[PDB]
Symmetry: C2
């Protein structure tokens, strides 16, 4: 059994992932990992809920409700959003290769935000 997150929680996670994407269009290390997490979760939520509880029309609009990271404030804001998503996944899904894949991808987002922040601090403006 895969485990399950409530629909309201999926909704919150989808919103946070979209916010990170909107901020990272020009940072493909970040965006490609977020897209992976989003596409994975879009797949899972369909499996966790019947068509009766979650109609196609409502489903197809939950993770896909139808850009350069260059400031410290932006690294911090994104790190916080990543923490929100990671904490939520850890709270709701069992330890296993399925969830590990997402947690590793989210950690790699943090590795990118860390590299960016470091570059700003050393080579950017006071």
């Amino acid at each position: 059994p895969a485990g399950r997150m409530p629909l309201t929680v999926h909704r919150n996670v989808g919103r946070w992932l979209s916010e990170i994407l909107h901020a990272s269009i020009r940072d493909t290390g970040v965006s490609s990992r977020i897209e992976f997490v989003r596409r994975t979760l879009h797949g899972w939520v369909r499996e966790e809920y019947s068509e009766t509880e979650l109609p196609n029309a409502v489903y197809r609009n939950l993770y896909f409700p139808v850009g350069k990271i260059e400031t410290i404030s932006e690294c911090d804001r994104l790190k916080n959003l990543v923490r929100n998503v990671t904490d939520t996944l850890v709270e709701n899904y069992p330890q296993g290769l399925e969830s590990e894949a997402l947690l590793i991808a989210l950690d790699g987002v943090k590795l990118e935000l860390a590299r960016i922040r470091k570059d700003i601090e050393m080579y950017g403006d006071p």
Copy 2:
């Protein structure tokens, strides 16, 4: 077990990838951003290979040994280079055998993260390590 990519690797190729992952792991098991990603890839492939090969092609005793199987820390430029090449070998082999999809994408991401970590460690060695 039924969930894996729509393709397969030759047994000799699995063995090579196993060897490369083990070598990376032996050299970096104290670099947790590298080792945790490598362990994920090893564990994943270990599950897949069992379904790709029958018990007569790959007996249980042979199977157990395929993926399973110094300071343990990356501290030289030489090691960064070696590991970067082993990572490249693994990544190149995966794309040669498994089609694009979420299943293999998880692996390719983890392996890209290893490269992100090698890069950070390399920069630390260059700036803060021995200038001669």
